[PDB]
Write a protein that binds this ligand. Structure first.
Ligand SMILES: NC(=O)c1ccc[n+]([C@@H]2O[C@H](COP(=O)([O-])OP(=O)(O)OC[C@H]3O[C@@H](n4cnc5c(N)ncnc54)[C@H](O)[C@@H]3O)[C@@H](O)[C@H]2O)c1
Ligand SMILES: NC(=O)c1ccc[n+]([C@@H]2O[C@H](COP(=O)([O-])OP(=O)(O)OC[C@H]3O[C@@H](n4cnc5c(N)ncnc54)[C@H](O)[C@@H]3O)[C@@H](O)[C@H]2O)c1
Ligand SMILES: CCCCCC[C@@H](C)NC=O
Ligand SMILES: CCCCCC[C@@H](C)NC=O
Ligand SMILES: [Zn+2]
Ligand SMILES: [Zn+2]
Ligand SMILES: [Zn+2]
Ligand SMILES: [Zn+2]
Lengths: 374, 374
């Protein structure tokens, strides 16, 4: 048994910005009251993990990254009632404490227990459960899934269908839920409408899927990488455009294609130029622009408020606006009923040991989601 | 009769920025086939008219301003079907053509026939109906109500209850509907929510009324002029604060008062600093901030997109988001059914000829709405 004991296991540790992950042996303390230790089965590689490597998203180093994952509960601390050993689960980078102002508000999901805003790199009690040869190792957004075992707070873990294929449903831990929810729950795309989606990674394609589920008439997929277009069309895009092809700014291109602008635009890249273009490309009277991509820390846009006065809405969200713990089981249940499929988003499957290869596939533009198997 | 003939009458003309209006003898052409010539009865003085005088809102000069009004139809073009000579009517500075993409969208109201953004100062056929000593004068927002007679497009006039008191319901032609709608329709203020309203002029007080009607639990009225506070309390505000009383910026004061920020914030002034403060004072995870005020023509806000990414919604609207021609009769009918009262907003009544005194009252902070009688 490992229960009650310190586990020595393999993890991918980032010691320095802009450097490869190091496969280290690390020490993983057992779960305290209201904590859950998880044995990872599958972890996806998301651009947000790469934002930390590049220094675009600041969090304390050294760190174990990883936040899109599925696993099986090895054990639970005192007081835990919602999961138990052997349950299939998905760790929640956005917690759902169920008690804070935000958790009680039916329209919001950014729980006050998150470690996203001002990152400390700990669990909710303010300490770390990882050491690598006595040196302490920071957590990432409470979940740190690029390790064979991790420890997370009870309110940051969801119990899912016992029959769930973890190598696929890990995507519901971040990329798919974020993209799909940004369309169906944050934008609330109306049927018959026209949508523009900027960026066709795992998250952008899931936005395409959500717009299709919502009944959009037109979904205009925008990417500088034309290799992304075939999958975008497969998942419901009606047209694909590459900004590099044009002398005009892409917002003007989109407005001229759509009788003055789209009804719903989504920025799913994380760049200020495209966030501006996404806002400007939605119709000034009836358009809604949603920020999904995470911009580099603390860089500003110059905004003429006249852009909003005529009737536009500009908004953003974390995790597709889904309240994490109650939504994740439902989305997995939808997956099990084949309401949507995730296979098209999973381009590569590698053993955990090949994390760096999986990141290079992401940086190269060649992959959508690489899933790491433990 | 005057039907089919040029009418000679008086109008208040603005010949130059930052100068008084001049009461001039003008000639008003008969209406063309889908136009309506109206005899004015009552016109309100809105800050938006003063924005043109001060150069804050750009429009071609020389011009006849005025857009908040009620009157009696003198004559119609032959293709007119929705009003007749003798009907009471409110001119619509936002038209409702009933045909365009925006008019057919249930959620939007900024009809494509508008002369609001990028104004030409004409009627919808691109021509003008006013002359002074035979030389043309520009219209304002399609309506030009500071004149004893004006001509408007049919799609920019609503027929109202023949029994209604025109010296009161003229406010439904702008200030009241804009504020009220901004709360109930644009923000969709929810029962038990907290709201902050920046600016307590006729429009801001109408936002206070709307938040109260929607059942907000707290309505924090913000004004640098504390003489505006007693009326705000009368109309539903729970608290009134003056930013100048505090050592910290008003957004931080409001966040600390409201467990992290209001659910709905409204900027009802037209200044960039208060648009920023209003955005920042709504809660980062669940807040909605609405721009109502008209910003000055040449200025930008500096916005970090992270402000929206956590879950904020930022939007603007014209005329409270009301589809003008269908809504204005219903709001007049609500008034006649005693659902709300307008008397608190009307602080001064003056003859048309004393228009410059009415603007002086507005500029000195003394009035809410002055209504001019013809
Ligand atoms: N808000 C959230 O809850 C949330 C959650 C997950 C990820 N994200 C963010 O969403 C964004 C997308 O993540 P992903 O994993 O799908 O990324 P990805 O790197 O797989 O995909 C991004 C896509 O954008 C394209 N692209 C890059 N620059 C472009 C430009 N200038 N113009 C047009 N296309 C461009 C790329 O070619 C790529 O196809 C990232 O910023 C990520 O951090 C946000
Ligand atoms: N979007 C629309 O359809 C629409 C329609 C009508 C009016 N408006 C606009 O709404 C705004 C308000 O119109 P109004 O007629 O009520 O104006 P108003 O001048 O009567 O009132 C504005 C109030 O804001 C207060 N104020 C000024 N500066 C302030 C500051 N820095 N901090 C706090 N309070 C401040 C003033 O003391 C005053 O009470 C104007 O910009 C006007 O153009 C917009
Ligand atoms: C609020 C800033 C945090 C945004 C980045 C979150 C990211 C780690 N989540 C999923 O990819
Ligand atoms: C497109 C912005 C122009 C808004 C000016 C509207 C104003 C004239 N209406 C009422 O005050
Ligand atoms: Zn919570
Ligand atoms: Zn992610
Ligand atoms: Zn007005
Ligand atoms: Zn129209």
């Amino acid at each position: 048994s490992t229960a009650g004991k310190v586990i020595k296991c393999k993890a991918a540790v980032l010691w320095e910005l802009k450097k490869p992950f190091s496969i280290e042996e690390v020490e993983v303390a057992p779960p305290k009251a209201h904590e859950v230790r998880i044995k990872m089965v599958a972890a996806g590689i998301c651009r947000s993990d790469e934002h930390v490597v590049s220094g675009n998203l600041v969090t304390p180093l050294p760190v174990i990254l990883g936040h899109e994952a599925a696993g099986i509960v090895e054990s639970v601390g005192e007081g835990v009632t919602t999961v138990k050993p052997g349950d299939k689960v998905i760790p929640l980078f956005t917690p759902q404490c169920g008690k804070c102002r935000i958790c009680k508000n039916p329209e919001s999901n950014y729980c006050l227990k998150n470690d996203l805003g001002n990152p400390r790199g700990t669990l909710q009690d303010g300490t770390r459960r990882f050491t690598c040869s006595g040196k302490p190792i920071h957590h990432f957004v409470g979940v740190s899934t690029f390790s064979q075992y991790t420890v997370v707070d009870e309110n940051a873990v969801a119990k899912i269908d016992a029959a769930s294929p973890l190598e696929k449903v890990c995507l519901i831990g971040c990329g798919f839920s974020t993209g799909y929810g940004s369309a169906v729950k944050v934008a609330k795309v109306t049927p018959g409408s026209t949508c523009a989606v900027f960026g066709l990674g795992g998250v952008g394609l899931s936005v395409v899927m959500g717009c299709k589920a919502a009944g959009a008439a037109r979904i205009i997929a925008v990417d500088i990488n034309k290799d992304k277009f075939a999958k975008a069309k497969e998942l419901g895009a009606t047209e694909c455009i590459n900004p590099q092809d044009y002398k005009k700014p892409i917002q003007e291109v989109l407005k001229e294609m759509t009788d003055g602008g789209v009804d719903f635009s989504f920025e799913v890249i994380g760049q200020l130029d495209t966030m501006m273009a996404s806002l400007l490309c939605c119709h000034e009277a009836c358009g809604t622009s949603v920020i999904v991509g995470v911009p580099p820390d603390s860089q500003n846009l110059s905004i003429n408020p006249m852009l909003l006065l005529t009737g536009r809405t500009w908004k953003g969200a974390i995790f597709g606006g889904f309240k994490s713990k109650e939504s994740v089981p439902k989305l997995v249940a939808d997956f099990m009923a084949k309401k949507f499929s995730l296979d098209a988003l999973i381009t590569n499957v590698l053993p955990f040991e090949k994390i760096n290869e999986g990141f290079d596939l992401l940086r190269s533009g060649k992959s959508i989601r690489t899933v790491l198997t433990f």
